[PDB]
Design a binder for this molecule. Structure first.
Ligand code: VO4
Length: 160
């Protein structure tokens, strides 16, 4: 795992053992945004519900928002994601399978929204700690759209 903004938001790949989850907890992770689809989780953990129970067992509060590999959140998903990440700001981990593409896209989105960074600046800020973050054309196009609509996203996120 890696911190983009220390003890506020970080990223990781999909754990294959409970040991890796304990390491998250030791690093200060409190909340986990789970991005892989069901089938990706069920390959390493048997059942999605079981994986999430192991997260809770280890004191982590999870939210599952499945994004296909190489893909991006839908608009409804993104609103949910950003409300989740900004509801409780400390100790947030985001993960996909590799920890690079989907994860890198959400982290970059977070910087674009909270700090007002340009897209290229946000991508490079994530690549500092996660080389190759943000992998696909669809992901880069998504980031351009978020940056262009930053004021509108913030308004919707902070409504209610
Ligand atoms: O599971 V990922 O979006 O690093 O390819």
């Amino acid at each position: 795992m890696y911190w983009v903004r220390r003890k506020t938001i970080g990223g990781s790949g999909l754990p294959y053992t409970e040991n890796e989850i304990l390491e998250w907890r030791k690093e200060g992770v409190k909340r986990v945004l789970v991005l892989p689809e069901d089938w990706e989780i069920e390959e390493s953990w048997g059942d999605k519900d079981y994986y999430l129970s192991i997260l809770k067992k280890n004191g982590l509060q999870p939210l599952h928002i499945p994004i296909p590999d190489g893909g991006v959140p839908s608009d409804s998903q993104f609103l949910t994601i950003m409300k989740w990440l900004l509801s409780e700001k400390e100790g947030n981990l985001v993960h996909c399978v590799g920890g690079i593409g989907r994860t890198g896209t959400i982290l970059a989105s977070y910087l674009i929204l909270t700090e007002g960074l340009e897209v290229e600046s946000a991508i490079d800020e994530v690549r500092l700690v996660r080389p190759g973050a943000v992998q696909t054309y669809e992901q880069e196009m998504f980031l351009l759209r978020v940056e262009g609509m930053r004021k509108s996203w913030l308004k919707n996120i902070y409504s209610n």
